Homo-oligomer: A and B are copies of this chain.
Amino acid sequence: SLTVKAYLLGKEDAAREIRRFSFCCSPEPEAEAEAAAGPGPCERLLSRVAALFPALRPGGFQAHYRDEDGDLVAFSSDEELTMAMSYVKDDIFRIYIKEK
């Protein structure tokens, strides 16, 4: 299991709302194309953040993760998630949520 921490950013980049959800270490929830048609972790995470942060649009936001440099990188692909977890050594995945 891997708890993912999300940080909501308003206009002054100030923490509006905080919420976390339990995630599986598994690559993807489903295997069939009826349930995985390419993505998996990204589409899963972006789903929870939507229901968790109703303050903004359901799918009208980008999640930005810090890199080795610290800069924000708006991720939106499973390939980018596998990389983002490579940074964190612990079982906590922090990310910066922003509404488009």
Contact = CB atoms under 8 A, between A and B. Distances in A.
A5 B67 contact: yes
Contact of A5 (B69, B83, B91): B69
Interface residues of A, number: 25
Interface in A60-100: 60, 64, 67-69, 71-75, 83, 89-92
A18 B72 contact: yes
A68 B73 contact: no
Total copies of the chain: 11
A44 interface: no
A17 interface: yes
Given A15-B71, A18-B74, 17 more contacts: A3-B67, A3-B68, A5-B67, A5-B71, A17-B72, A17-B74, A18-B67, A18-B71, A18-B72, A18-B73, A19-B73, A19-B75, A22-B83, A54-B90, A57-B68, A89-B90, A89-B92
